[PDB]
Amino acid sequence: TEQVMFQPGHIVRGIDFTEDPLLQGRLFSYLDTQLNRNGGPNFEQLPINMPRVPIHNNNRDGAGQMFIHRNKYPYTPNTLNSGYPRQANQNAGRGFFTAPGRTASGALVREVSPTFNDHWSQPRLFFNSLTPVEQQFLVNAMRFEISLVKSEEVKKNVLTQLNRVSHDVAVRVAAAIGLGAPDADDTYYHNNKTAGVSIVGSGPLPTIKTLRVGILATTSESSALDQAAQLRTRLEKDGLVVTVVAETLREGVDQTYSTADATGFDGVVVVDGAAALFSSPLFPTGRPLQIFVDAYRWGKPVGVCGGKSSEVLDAADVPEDGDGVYSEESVDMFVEEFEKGLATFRFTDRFALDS
Amino acid sequence: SPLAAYEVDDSTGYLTSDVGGPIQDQTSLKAGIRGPTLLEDFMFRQKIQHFDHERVPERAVNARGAGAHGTFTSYADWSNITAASFLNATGKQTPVFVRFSTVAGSRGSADTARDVHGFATRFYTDEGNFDIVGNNIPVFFIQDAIQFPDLIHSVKPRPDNEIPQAATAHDSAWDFFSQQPSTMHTLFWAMSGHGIPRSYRHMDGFGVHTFRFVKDDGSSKLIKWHFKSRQGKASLVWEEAQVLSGKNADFHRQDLWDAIESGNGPEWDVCVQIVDESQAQAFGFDLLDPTKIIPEEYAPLTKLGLLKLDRNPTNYFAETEQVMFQPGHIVRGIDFTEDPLLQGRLFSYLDTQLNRNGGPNFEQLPINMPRVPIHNNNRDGAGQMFIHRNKYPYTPNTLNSGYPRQANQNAGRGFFTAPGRTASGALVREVSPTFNDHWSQPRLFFNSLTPVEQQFLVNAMRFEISLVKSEEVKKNVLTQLNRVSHDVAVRVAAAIGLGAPDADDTYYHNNKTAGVSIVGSGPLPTIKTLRVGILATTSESSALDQAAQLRTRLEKDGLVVTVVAETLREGVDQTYSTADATGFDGVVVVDGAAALFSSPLFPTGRPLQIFVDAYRWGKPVGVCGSEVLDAADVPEDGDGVYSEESVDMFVEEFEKGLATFRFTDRFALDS
Amino acid sequence: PLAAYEVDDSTGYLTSDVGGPIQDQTSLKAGIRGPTLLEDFMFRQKIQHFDHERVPERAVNARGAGAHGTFTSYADWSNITAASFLNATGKQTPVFVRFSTVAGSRGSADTARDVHGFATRFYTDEGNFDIVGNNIPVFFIQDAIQFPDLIHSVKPRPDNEIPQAATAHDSAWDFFSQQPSTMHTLFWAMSGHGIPRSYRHMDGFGVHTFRFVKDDGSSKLIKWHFKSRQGKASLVWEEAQVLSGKNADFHRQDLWDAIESGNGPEWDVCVQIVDESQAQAFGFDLLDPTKIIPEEYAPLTKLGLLKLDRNPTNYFAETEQVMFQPGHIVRGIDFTEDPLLQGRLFSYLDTQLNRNGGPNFEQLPINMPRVPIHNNNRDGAGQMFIHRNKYPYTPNTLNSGYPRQANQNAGRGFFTAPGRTASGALVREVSPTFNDHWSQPRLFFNSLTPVEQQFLVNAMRFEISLVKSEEVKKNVLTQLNRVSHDVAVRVAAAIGLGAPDADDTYYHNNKTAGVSIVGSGPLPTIKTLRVGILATTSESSALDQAAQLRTRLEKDGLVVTVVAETLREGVDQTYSTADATGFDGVVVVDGAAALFASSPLFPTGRPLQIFVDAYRWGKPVGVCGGKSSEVLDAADVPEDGDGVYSEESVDMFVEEFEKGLATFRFTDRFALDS
């Protein structure tokens, strides 16, 4: 992984470049930068970089040269090696070839094409295509980052650009930084949308295999660990990755409260045998409840399994009838409902919106 | 062998990039037929990038050299003196690679420079690579490794103008020699024919330092490595070496390559002198001192095995340029000594390879790989070619069950420091007083040379010191030479118009030692590979007939025959224009060519000058079939001068001449 | 010039690189006969440095030597170029020049037969401008992508790395005969241009067509030609072979010495200037680097004087580390679509990463400009600057918009010639206008003198006789025959093959000025030329003669070496170390006549050999004193021979001998094919 050295210059017959000036310059950079990383010119000889076909060429020597070349006439044209290696091109040897319809005309220029000049319509197209909560998250990311910019001039300049994409984005972002948004400039504003760029709108996940479920239990009650073992079995059958959390390790418990965190899970379940936990030298004060509260605040499916739920849900300020909040005595029923929540993945009705 | 797996065949196939994409490489991609070249041309950039990065730093010293592969075969089970696995059974064979080199010249300098020579041998043993990084001279200029940059800066070109190339013939070098008297012994060797060997095959190999042989019972003895050439000892003469440096900079590397290609691969008996630890100061000097030899009179040679070089490299850069030797490549059964020159060497080779290779994985290059499994916790680094399966590369571990396991005197045939070794005293930057005699052994060496040999060494010093501009340095040089031999001081002083200092007899003596003279080592044991130039003419069908008759005879006796004439044709190898006496070990003029001794086809007098140069330089010379000998002012009665009508008779005599190799009576001596 | 970076060690105690005083002569050991200690930091820092002294040699032109100097413009050249270094009569700009061979490694001999580099850096007030040229105006190949093919073929065979610094081997001649574009440069290399007498006696060429661009955007096509003020001179090959052995450092020493004596070499920096409309008007393509513009079609314009007058202080730091680039270009100059030039632009910037081992090679003193640098290049190994601007990106407001963009209209920016265009398919195709590989080789050959043509035939005979492959030799004769049937026949005769039937397609009888060495006439100056005076310590009068000649010769700027059996006052060299290749002219004092008729002090026949060699190689030779027959007879040299002198009078001898030094070579001494 550290030594793999990719290049857009690693192209094959059947593919060609375009005159995208970003692409064009990349072709130089990767070949050159590999000299930096590898410290010499024979980086294509590292195992991870080698091809899976024979190499025939007249490249020689260089630091770290791993081949012993038999051909002692590595120049073209030659007779002393019978004209080998032979040239490959469109008509012989399945050579790479530049698309033959490609042309260039005009002055040799350091000029930008005016066709590149619309920097704002597509940002607006992308924004228009996000759902309302998704638009809010984007506004909030901008509010977070721009509020950390110290220069008032830079912040003003940022609002000027954002406003060219969307007046509303500029207004909402300005609100957090205590500046005024400039007046609407409608040149590039439009209402068009495009498919397949939204995450929130992309629907439930097609598979929940690998998703992580944290089961918060206790060693204080044999009943709680029995619940967690049963839940584990039912969940693991479906390819979910189960972590049972308790105060200390023992058979069946994967993780102590001290090392556990809501970020370790895609869904969190409390077994009702553990309701009492919701201070100790074994974990920070309030840790078990905070794992549940965090998972809820971050949109994850959360639930209590066993039939007794009000104690836990009330301590966590989590409404029993919320979307993505589960309570069932039946392990089977609990898991069936919970797995729907995992595919839904995030319950976005837990996030405030600008009005 | 690591090398077979990495050989790449390009005898068939379409050209590809390094990542296997078929491409072309003859025309740049352009915006129109007369247009500018495009940055998107990856074919151009990958090819030019590789070319732009072909070169690597030359070796800090010994940059000019050539290598070959071969085999070492043990003569015995040497258990009784060493635990070394490669020496543990009669007939046991180990692959070797050897590089020979000069020392001061950069990588494109002439082979026939006057210099110390490197003789570095890698034994790819079944218990690790073992390197003996030796020289063709048994003693070194300096007594402490820390002085190496001083010696080498003084011998290498002056740093303002990088003049002169591959030569000690300048002020700085002789300033160093005259200020650092330890240099005298190696200097005498370099100023002898040992500085200009006839080939790599006609020189011996020496480890220089005292090492230890260590037995499995922990006992040790002190040893000197001496590789004894089976081809004999032979030198050029200095004027021939100078001409050679211009006419064939590649002379030694060509000589070696050709010998191998012809099934005449060079051999050495790999030998040691072996003495007890108690004898470290028993011979009148300290065996930790790398400026001293053990005279053979005090310790004879034990023949351990045969070294044969019999395969050339496939790719010079990948094998010869990239081989990276280290005296730190040691194996169980061998140890170091407290020789301060050897001690510091240990650090230098490991570090300098980072410079050449540009990263730390230089032992992964095929030529540097061992021939046994590697088990260690070395990881990562630029150019990492392995994919290590062990994800717990730390010791001690339980998560990899304790592997790799520690090897030591009692486990896993580990290396171990000789257990009888000790250290005692202050931590000092002081030179042992036992190292202080810088002059007796140079005198021993000089005494041991034949009179003409002593003349040649004197003439070498006369040549070089006359090129020293500084009057003060010249005087200092005579001061030191005079401590070795008053006569050497006198004779050298005469050439530079200075007076020698009065005799200082402190270190004078009349002792001699066997095995250091070239001139005295007798005729060569074989003449195979030696070169005969037959000077002929296209004028006379009879000249060509004569030449071809000589050729049949001489080639059956293993000699390399070159028939020279005005122009090439069937049976003629070389034109006069490209021919030179330095190309030959013997010269024969065929009777029919007597006329040649002006043409637009070669320089005026070239045919005669080849014959005259060969005679002046001491070679066997002859005419097969009066006038030629008169023209060349060569006496018909001369030793190593042949004059016969009978081809068989001529061949028989001439071949004795080739064994004698040099007729030293052609050289004037001081009286 | 680089004074700020000099370090003086003429006084003081030894220190580490961090200024701690230390010693460096004995290792630290556990006891006086003990093992060396790892804690010996004095040892490790010294030896680490030594271990890492070397850097990769240049991929080509590894063997070379450099000096500092000054360029002076002759005029304000505004009317043809915006280049600031050319914008005022008398304007001076510091330069550094490196001269080189091409194929040999470091340590190979100066006097190998080869193309030679002539790379000039102008440290201009608008940036460093490099002209990375050669001593031959045309190059072997027509596309940069072919460079590794040419260089692999010329460099040593890669199994044994043989032969050093030579085209005289199969691969080279295989490549030349398979790639006929090579013929022009090949003919130049086989002429005296392949073995120049010194770096000072050769010219410099940019090779490619470039553009001169005016501030108004208009452009003209130019060829750069640095015309030597020392004259043109070559060695003969046999002499060159001996020199390679006797003095591998010959050209570097010659240059070093000329500068130290106050005879720094000079060139007129010239251009041929033509209109863009003339790119195809001369019967060949100006984009084609295998073609010269005959001077009859476009005369040379003298732009200014280049003079080298200061040697480096440290060869490694200055000469070894200087890193030229044709991409070091300045406002007022631009490139052309020459496909050889085009790819070179990439190569030099990349290859310096190899040599320097890091990206900040422009910060080495020798590579620095003499004007402020303002850019947003940052970090990288070996970063020597401490940049204050903490906003190194454009566009910025946080650094007020600095550095500002420079272009045609502001800040005196470089700009591409605005009339330049491209048109057509993106192609890996050679222009048919490049296809004539033979007419110019023929024009060149036709322009040489008869003995010069013989020398070139003989170079080819020498090299091609060493090619082992019969098929390569036959292919070589096929290509040479397309240039000249007579050349093919004459070369063929040495290798015992038949030349193919005449093919007259590209034969012609046209000639061009300024390409012949032999025809360029006597040297305009004899200052620095070397005279060896052969004497004897056996006769006090021979020493007196040598001394009187010394005075007379040295007065005229000649470098005089007196040779005798042994050194003493007034004798510079012994016979043992003397050689005819060390001299441009040889004089025997008649008091020394007896040595020309055995000694432990030099090789048998040495004194006579020096005289005979000098004669055979065409040099002026003579005897001073009145008694010349003994020496001249022994040397088989005729008294009435041109370039052979015999006078009693020291004054008269020197006047005649000096005319001979300017003639330089007496060509009547060389046999010609019938």
Ligand code: HEM
């Ligand atoms: C007994 C005295 C010594 C002998 C016989 C010796 C022998 C050699 C030989 C034969 C080589 C070339 C190996 C090859 O062919 O690649 C070499 C290289 C080298 N030597 Fe030593 N040497 C000696 C002393 C030293 C000392 C004292 C130092 C430094 C403290 C030293 C540092 C080097 C370095 C830096 C190289 C280049 C190695 C490489 O690039 O792989 N030498 N020496």
Ligand code: HEM
């Ligand atoms: C018109 C033809 C050319 C001329 C006159 C030319 C001239 C030179 C000169 C004079 C040097 C040595 C500069 C110095 O003294 O440091 C040099 C080095 C070099 N050249 Fe060129 N060259 C030409 C074509 C090329 C081409 C086609 C390539 C590759 C595409 C190339 C790649 C190099 C490289 C890699 C070096 C070593 C540069 C360095 O290490 O700094 N040359 N050339």
Ligand SMILES: [Ca+2]
């Ligand atoms: Ca193509």
Ligand SMILES: [Ca+2]
């Ligand atoms: Ca010096």
Ligand SMILES: [Ca+2]
């Ligand atoms: Ca000898």
Ligand SMILES: [Ca+2]
């Ligand atoms: Ca063991």
Ligand SMILES: [Ca+2]
């Ligand atoms: Ca070859």
Ligand SMILES: [Ca+2]
């Ligand atoms: Ca000439």
Ligand SMILES: [Ca+2]
């Ligand atoms: Ca590096």
Ligand SMILES: [Ca+2]
């Ligand atoms: Ca521009």
